[PDB]
Every structure is written in structure tokens, then in C-alpha cells.
Amino acid sequence: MKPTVIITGASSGVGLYGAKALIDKGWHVIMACRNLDKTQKVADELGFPKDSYTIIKLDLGYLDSVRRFVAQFRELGRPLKALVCNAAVYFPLLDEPLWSADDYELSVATNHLGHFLLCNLLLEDLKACPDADKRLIILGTVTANKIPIPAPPDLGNFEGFEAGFKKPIAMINNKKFKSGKAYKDSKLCNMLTTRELHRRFHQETGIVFNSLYPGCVADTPLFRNHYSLFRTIFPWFQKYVSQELAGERVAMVVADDKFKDSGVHWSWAGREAFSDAQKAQRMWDLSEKLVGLV
């Protein structure tokens, strides 16, 4: 069998072009996507050969969808060599929070909590795969420590998580909703998750747990509308990596020999090994409760 990789959010941007690059390298890509009609359309638009991918429904904003995705993946009987947590949402300048299917603020629910559950469930599949080289890659932040969200992340003491994170709670630190900061908070949780996966499981399983910053992928829909609004107001600036190159960088960190060290953040590659350590442990323990692992 072709080596098998799951990519969340493969119907757009980095995920789509990562799928393209991995198909080109001889992998079978599981396009783990929420909109099946869209996903099929875009695969066909790029000429993806149907013998090299499978589309399976996944809605990261619905924890039971995550569980069903895993079950449906397992029915294929393909051993899992790699997982890429790529999917994300961002709601620019959104004054009132949106809610997941589980009544969790939608940015954190989708970007972090769904992935957090997915990683924990699929750890069994990665363990069962007999390959020596198996990898779990999380799409992260620029650095392991503007575009166009000025606000830094701040998880506080996870007061929002501690109180159970249900609506009307809207931020991890239980302060007032800010949609840009909500995105940044979620991405920091992605980075902390990578740190914790490595710490908890690398020695026991041999699986490689790394994070990736592919570059500023300015053409994707994620930040596109925010950037165009910014340029409309401040017309003082010129209009960076292509989607295709960002995808090729995903493919490298999944498949290539140079990227076999675990517990690092690959940035464009620059390499950074991993109080973030203490915060990461708390993020982990509380996230388990929120996603029903305990």
C-alpha cells in the first residue's frame, strides 16, 4: 500500500496543496474535510488521481464528528503513517462569539479542541502502524515562544477552561470575547499540544511530534478578507509563500529524512526545540476534560 496520511482541512489553502504535494510523492491522502461537495470539486480541479486519496467527513467543531471520522477512517483498513492537523478557522472583527456543536467558542473549539481529541484518538492508529517512521504534524505559529492580528495570545490561568468552557464563556482566560485573540489563543494551544505530545509519547512510541510554520501564505482565504479590508483603509502598502510552496513544505516535514527529529518547530527551515512547559501541561489536562477523554 501507498503510505497513508490524514490531512485535516484539505479543501483549501495549505491543506489542499499539502495533499497535492504528498500525492505527488506517492502517498495516499485522507482528505478529512467538512464539505464533501467542495472537497471533491477542488480535488478534481487540481486533477487529483482518485486512486491516491479518500474524502472522509470531518467537522472539527463537533466532537462526535471527530469520533465518527476516526471510525470511518478505520473501516478503510489502511495503516496510519502520518497525521497533519492543518484545519483552522478565523472570524475577523466578529463582535459576538460563534458556538460549536458542543457550545464551545468556535475558534478554539475547531482549531484546538477538535484536533486535541483527534490526536488522542489517532495515537492508537499511529501506534498500530508497523512503519519505523511515523509523524504527527501540527500547523502552528511563527515562533515557538501584525498578520493581521496585533494582539498576543494569553491563556491566563485557563479560567475559562476551568469553569468548563461552555457558552456564555468565550475565551480560555474567561475574559471578554475578541475574535482575533481567540484565533491566536487557539494557535498557541496547537503549539502547546505538540510540546505535550512529544513529552508524553515520543519515548514510549517513537512517533515524531512536530509543529510547522510554512510561511506567510497570504493568498489563502484564512486572512484574505481581513488583509483586503486593512489595505482598503491603509492603501499605503504593497500586496510571503505561494500556496503550492507551503504545501510542499508540509510534504517535506511529513515525508522527508531531514525532518525526523521530534519535539521541534520547523519554521521558514529554521529549527526550534521545545513556563510554556507548565502552561502546556495544564492546557493538556483541562482539554482532556473538555473533549471527554476522562
Ligand SMILES: NC(=O)C1=CN([C@@H]2O[C@H](COP(=O)(O)OP(=O)(O)OC[C@H]3O[C@@H](n4cnc5c(N)ncnc54)[C@H](OP(=O)(O)O)[C@@H]3O)[C@@H](O)[C@H]2O)C=CC1
Ligand atoms: N495562511 C497563513 O498565512 C498561515 C496559516 N497557518 C496555518 O495553516 C493552516 C491552514 O491555513 P490556511 O490554508 O491559510 O487556511 P484556509 O482557510 O485556506 O483553509 C482552512 C481549511 O480548514 C478547514 N476547516 C475549517 N473549519 C473546519 C472544521 N470545522 N472541520 C474540518 N475542517 C475545517 C477548511 O474547510 P472549508 O474548505 O470547508 O472552509 C479549509 O479546508 C491553519 O492551521 C493556519 O493556522 C499558519 C501560518 C500562516
Ligand SMILES: [Cl-]
Ligand atoms: Cl494503495
